[PDB]
Design a protein around this ligand. Structure first.
Ligand SMILES: CCCCCCCCCCCCO[C@@H]1O[C@H](CO)[C@@H](O[C@H]2O[C@H](CO)[C@@H](O)[C@H](O)[C@H]2O)[C@H](O)[C@H]1O
Ligand SMILES: CCCCCCCCCCCCO[C@@H]1O[C@H](CO)[C@@H](O[C@H]2O[C@H](CO)[C@@H](O)[C@H](O)[C@H]2O)[C@H](O)[C@H]1O
Ligand SMILES: CCCCCCCCCCCCO[C@@H]1O[C@H](CO)[C@@H](O[C@H]2O[C@H](CO)[C@@H](O)[C@H](O)[C@H]2O)[C@H](O)[C@H]1O
Ligand SMILES: CCCCCCCCCCCCO[C@@H]1O[C@H](CO)[C@@H](O[C@H]2O[C@H](CO)[C@@H](O)[C@H](O)[C@H]2O)[C@H](O)[C@H]1O
Ligand SMILES: CCCCCCCCCCCC
Ligand SMILES: CCCCCCCCCCCC
Ligand SMILES: CCCCCCCCCC
Ligand SMILES: CCCCCCCCCC
Ligand SMILES: CCCCCC
Ligand SMILES: CCCCCC
Lengths: 1034, 48
């Protein structure tokens, strides 16, 4: 191939241009994400029972659906909540790599079997099945800058004009309205209902009868009589459209002929379906849309599709209404990726400069500078072919690859320059000759180096996909690099390199190059004279090498190990959890204090606060609040104390002072579905129908025993709510039967008044919306109000609730949890400082065994994947080590010579460990992949040193020492050329600030540290390794 | 230990075992060889 393309440089260019063409087209089409999809698919069933307590919801909805969830493929576990908000959510979590479409279909298939068994009120609220993330992709805030629309007005507009179109957009798994759509609110008065001898039953009957849409057929309808000329649709009753029309609904005509209208017994206003969720944007009245990403859908493409849909709506907004962007997770992805793209360009420019220092002519400098982007662009086309995405890991794969790419190019270019200088051959002849003696090694090296990177593509589960991004990106680049080194690089060397005369090392130049060339030529003599002296000693460097290996070992076990750094993503959240029974007014009081803090104490860092009352991760009226915080740009937040971690630490500390409130700010993790580094997620199970009260006692017993082990366990707490006072009312069946009062009238009157009742639909400005009857607030506030509600008996006498009912105070659950179909209580907690999660979990198991009869446990979420599989590192790197040896043994046709190359591994590891240790970094993914890259180049340097030496001994028939000294002398320039180019190329990452600097700092630090030790030590140690190894084995 | 009948055992399997087995990995249809307990109201027509 070299000889073919040396004679056909335009062919070589055409191939290179087509590779760049495919890469360019790949970049324009390839999906962009922060990380690859590793989170298991989760299908969530949401149902609503208006006016229902936690137990009613659980025992009429949750349990019925749960018992029907069977014959579902690849189900890991099932968890459910039954709240006193009248809400249930059943989350079915599936195995990694499960088709989310089939998962939804199967869950939906089983739900339809349960549907007819569910109460009619639950069916009419709608039972949704969704396949989305638990967290929010973004929040689309809506305000009125002219203050012409209230919180309720904006919520209705968003619901009626915006929500539906956003919900139907591809990639949107779930849309949450921060507010309510308007409903026709019939606020009933019990005093007036009793006065006219009517009940909520009469009102509901009247609305269904007089808010009706009647199909009345046609005049001259088919089949018609002979001679019919007229054909027209008959229009009878249509839905009411206004409060006025609902107001003049005739309930009864009195005996004296006077009329009782609905407005005579109720206040009739256009109000929300619910009054649970109230949002603010920087203190101003607001609504918005909490959008969740559909399972496996692209975040950036979905975000773009949402903005495109919002852009359609804006022109038809009422005066003052404006879209604000208070929370978005996508900007960081876009900016962080683009910051890595910028360091690629910067690295190529720094490569060019280091190349110009050594080659000292513009044309020659372009040969290595052209090779890199050709291969990198080519690599994007290979990722496209294999269904990989442009992500943080694949992008950092490109950055680390540059080192291996320039080396391939530099090895080829430098060796031609060396041949031209030693013999005086023209570029075209020296190229043919140079390719002849290294093209074999280049192909061989790539197969040795593939054995380093391929193995970590066989990591399993969550971690697997992360390491597989690097493996395939780096291995693909190396493969293209060799193919580029055999086609283009030779063709460019034959056409673009300037003829060098025999013995000319540029010492005759005048200027900087003149001095540098004479400095390097002298430095090369100083080097070989130094190595020549080292080879006489030998033994004192074997002992010095054992010191570097023991030094490495000590640093490796001292250095703390992590996974993926927590990045500042320009956004975070603040949870407001009051104790159950706390009012909406109390939660707003706490939300105001949180909003106040960010607007006053964090002016320089915080841009906007979107606070929602009666919302956590899902709707939870009255006692729960959440605040979405968007920070200013990273550039405007310089230093560590102005970054998310420090901001949320100061916020959490300030909010600790708030009374009767659990208020904390938290940065959402790297993999949100991994959780925290040393957190555990524990489930306490009722295995023997013990009940809620007995399971609470068992939970309290476990929490009390966990409190005695602060040496092991930290912040072991329940994730759920505590029992609260509830108003137990007993309908006396005998007394109701005696007075002639039907139990259906009692239950409807109580439910409708105190809980609310969804009667039927009406048309509000052309859109179908709900009609709700309920008590006016003031008649459903006090226990004594119960007796103000009258039911009509068969005889026509109005009977107060006090006549046929008794009541008392008792305690019950506002939120009942179930895990795998059994009553459960989720207990969170973390391992105490210096203790592993395994030990923390092992103790929690020990304590759980001491609990009463019928109380079991289980691990869920982050604790599920933890226990099943963890740490398969020694296995894959042991195979890697074996296969590298075997590949080297085949290359050198020797069982012994491979050791002379494999003994360089520690020389690059010590420098990486020192760099990471002295910057306070951790042994993480970015350190590991950066270390494999460092080992790759250092081993490749050693291979070419050992190859050149063995060649001189085999072909030229030189002595061991003479050949080894000739090898290192010839291999010095290209080693330093690569080392300087790559070390300086990763400088932008080391000193990097702004978006994604945590990852950049982590990558560059380990590489820069590893490269400098690998470069300075290898040039003195490789010649010792070869000489020593060659001597021990004949 | 002769403390549970065919009916008692059938209820226990149906109420505490069947559902978890039916959701176990690789398990398809699950047939109960027995019946779960229901509240049985056995009416007397003479008394009615
Ligand atoms: C050796 C012989 C074989 C040669 C192979 C020839 C087939 C390869 C080319 C076809 C595939 C490229 O398909 C092409 O993709 C590019 C992005 O990369 C898109 O490119 C375009 O996209 C949109 C239109 O949709 C434009 O607004 C935009 O300016 C442009 O980037 C084209 O819309 C699409 O038609
Ligand atoms: C020299 C070595 C190579 C360096 C690395 C190569 C760059 C890598 C960039 C990664 C991020 C690219 O992300 C990708 O950007 C291109 C535009 O550039 C977008 O493609 C865009 O085409 C045109 C460009 O005007 C736009 O009108 C259109 O809105 C959009 O489709 C893709 O939708 C996006 O996914
Ligand atoms: C699952 C698949 C199983 C297959 C696994 C194969 C992995 C082994 C790959 C090892 C790489 C060997 O790399 C290969 O080494 C041989 C050594 O004879 C070199 O071969 C060269 O060596 C010397 C040169 O002085 C000569 O004896 C020989 O004529 C020449 O071709 C090749 O130029 C090189 O490409
Ligand atoms: C903790 C790890 C430290 C890493 C250090 C890695 C090596 C540092 C760079 C190499 C410098 C060694 O410096 C080199 O040492 C050898 C052996 O001592 C000297 O060798 C000299 O002394 C020896 C014995 O005393 C004579 O046999 C030899 O003829 C003479 O030249 C070289 O003249 C000197 O240039
Ligand atoms: C898009 C890249 C264009 C590269 C053009 C290279 C020109 C090579 C000249 C060869 C003349 C024999
Ligand atoms: C999930 C089990 C691991 C399967 C992934 C294997 C990837 C093949 C690597 C191809 C090397 C070029
Ligand atoms: C939109 C789905 C991903 C498209 C694959 C990339 C195409 C590569 C063109 C060479
Ligand atoms: C797994 C590597 C096996 C090494 C073979 C030993 C060679 C001995 C030849 C005398
Ligand atoms: C390459 C895109 C980033 C622009 C510089 C901040
Ligand atoms: C994943 C186990 C630790 C990795 C050490 C390189």
């Amino acid at each position: 191939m070299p000889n073919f393309f040396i004679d056909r440089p335009i062919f070589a260019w055409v191939i290179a241009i087509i590779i760049m063409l495919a890469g360019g087209l790949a970049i324009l089409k390839l999906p962009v994400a922060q990380y690859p999809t590793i989170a298991p698919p989760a299908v969530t069933i949401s149902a609503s029972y208006p006016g229902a307590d936690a137990k009613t919801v659980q025992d009429t909805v949750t349990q019925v659906i749960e018992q029907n969830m069977n014959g579902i493929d690849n189900l890991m576990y099932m968890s459910s909540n039954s709240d006193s908000t009248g809400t249930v959510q059943i989350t079915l979590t599936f195995e990694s790599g499960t088709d989310a479409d089939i998962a939804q279909v199967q869950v939906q298939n089983k739900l339809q079997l349960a549907m007819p068994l569910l109460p009619q009120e639950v069916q009419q609220q709608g039972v949704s099945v969704e396949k989305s993330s638990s967290s929010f992709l973004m929040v689309v805030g809506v305000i009125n800058t002219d203050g012409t629309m209230t919180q309720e007005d904006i919520s209705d507009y968003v619901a009626a004009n915006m929500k539906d179109a956003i919900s139907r957009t591809s990639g949107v798994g779930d849309v949450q309205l921060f507010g309510s759509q308007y409903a026709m609110r019939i606020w009933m008065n019990p005093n007036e209902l009793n006065k006219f001898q009517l009940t909520p039953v009469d009102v509901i009957t009247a609305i269904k009868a007089q808010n009706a849409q009647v199909a009345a057929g046609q005049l001259g309808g088919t089949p018609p009589v002979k001679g019919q000329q007229l054909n027209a649709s008959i229009i009878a009753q249509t839905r009411l459209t206004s409060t006025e029309e609902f107001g003049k609904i005739l309930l009864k005509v009195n005996q004296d002929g006077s009329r009782v209208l609905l407005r005579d017994v109720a206040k009739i206003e256009l109000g929300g379906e619910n009054y649970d969720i109230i949002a603010e944007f920087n203190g101003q009245p607001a609504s918005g849309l909490g959008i969740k990403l559909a399972t496996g859908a692209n975040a950036l493409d979905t975000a773009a599709a949402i903005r495109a849909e919002l852009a359609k709506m804006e022109p038809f907004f009422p005066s003052g209404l404006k879209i604000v962007y208070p929370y978005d997770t996508t900007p960081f992805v876009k900016i962080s990726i683009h910051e890595v793209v910028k360091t690629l360009v910067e690295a190529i420019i720094l490569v060019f400069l280091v190349m110009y220092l050594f080659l000292q002519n513009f044309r020659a400098t372009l040969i290595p500078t052209i090779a890199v982007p050709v291969v990198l662009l080519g690599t994007f086309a290979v990722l496209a072919a294999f269904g990989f995405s442009i992500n943080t890991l694949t992008m950092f794969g490109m950055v680390l690859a540059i080192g291996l790419l320039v080396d391939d190019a530099i090895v080829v270019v430098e060796n031609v320059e060396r041949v031209m200088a030693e013999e005086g051959l023209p570029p075209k002849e020296a190229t043919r000759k140079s390719m002849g003696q290294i093209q074999g090694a280049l192909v061989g090296i790539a197969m040795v180096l593939s054995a380093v990177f391929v193995p970590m593509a066989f990591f399993g589960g969550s971690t697997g996909a992360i390491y597989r991004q690097f493996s395939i990106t780096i291995v693909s680049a190396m493969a293209l690099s060799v193919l580029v080194a055999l086609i283009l690089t030779p063709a460019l060397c034959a056409t673009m390199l300037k003829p060098i005369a025999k013995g000319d090392h540029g010492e005759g130049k005048k200027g900087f190059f003149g001095w540098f060339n004479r400095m390097f030529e002298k430095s090369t003599h100083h080097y070989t004279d130094s190595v020549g002296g080292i080879l006489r000693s030998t033994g004192r460097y074997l002992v010095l090498y054992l010191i570097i290996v023991v030094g490495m070992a000590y640093l490796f076990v001292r250095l703390p190990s992590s996974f993926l750094p927590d990045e500042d993503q320009g956004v975070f959240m603040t949870m407001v959890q009051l104790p159950a029974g706390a009012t909406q007014e109390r939660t707003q009081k706490v939300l105001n204090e949180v909003t106040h803090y960010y607007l006053t104490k964090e002016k320089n860092n915080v841009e906007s606060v979107f606070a929602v009352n009666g919302f956590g991760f899902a709707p939870r009226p009255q006692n729960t609040g959440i605040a979405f915080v968007s920070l200013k740009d990273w550039a405007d937040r310089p230093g560590e104390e102005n970054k998310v971690e420090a901001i949320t630490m100061r916020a959490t500390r300030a909010f600790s002072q708030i009374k009767d409130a659990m208020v904390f700010a938290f940065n959402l993790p790297a993999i949100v579905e991994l959780g925290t580094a040393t957190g555990f997620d524990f489930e306490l199970i009722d295995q023997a129908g013990l009940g809620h009260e007995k399971l609470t006692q068992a939970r309290n017993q476990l929490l009390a025993e966990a409190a005695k082990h602060p040496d092991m366990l930290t912040s072991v707490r329940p994730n759920g709510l505590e029992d609260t006072p509830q108003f137990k009312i007993d309908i006396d069946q005998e007394k109701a039967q005696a007075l002639g009062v039907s139990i259906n009238d009692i239950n409807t009157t109580l439910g409708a008044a105190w809980g609310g009742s969804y009667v039927n639909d009406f048309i509000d400005r052309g859109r179908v919306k709900k009609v709700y009857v309920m008590s006016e607030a003031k008649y459903r506030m006090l226990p004594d109000d119960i007796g103000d509600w009258y039911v009509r008996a068969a005889d026509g006498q109005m009977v107060p609730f006090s006549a046929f009912s008794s009541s008392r105070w008792e305690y019950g659950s506002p939120r009942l949890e179930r895990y795998n179909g059994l009553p459960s209580m989720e207990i969170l907690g973390q391992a105490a400082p210096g203790k592993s999660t395994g030990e923390a979990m092992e103790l929690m198991e020990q304590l759980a065994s001491k609990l009463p009869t019928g109380v079991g446990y289980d691990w869920t979420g982050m604790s599920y994947q933890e226990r099943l599989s963890g740490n398969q590192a020694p296995s894959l790197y042991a195979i890697s080590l074996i296969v590298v040896f075997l590949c080297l043994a085949a290359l050198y046709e020797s069982w012994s010579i491979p050791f002379s190359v494999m003994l360089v591994v520690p020389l690059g590891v010590i420098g990486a460990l020192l760099a990471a240790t002295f910057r306070g970094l951790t042994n993480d993914v970015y350190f590991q992949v950066g270390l494999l890259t460092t080992i790759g180049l250092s081993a490749k340097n050693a291979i070419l040193i050992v190859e050149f030496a063995k060649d001189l001994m085999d072909k030229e028939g030189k002595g061991l020492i003479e050949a080894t000294l000739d090898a290192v002398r010839m291999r010095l320039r290209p080693i330093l050329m690569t080392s300087l180019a790559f070390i300086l190329g990763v400088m932008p990452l080391v000193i990097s600030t702004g978006a994604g600097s945590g990852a950049q700092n982590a990558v560059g630090t380990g590489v820069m540290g590893g490269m400098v030790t690998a470069t300075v030590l290898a040039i003195f140690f490789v010649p010792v390794f070869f000489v020593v190894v060659r001597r021990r084995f004949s």
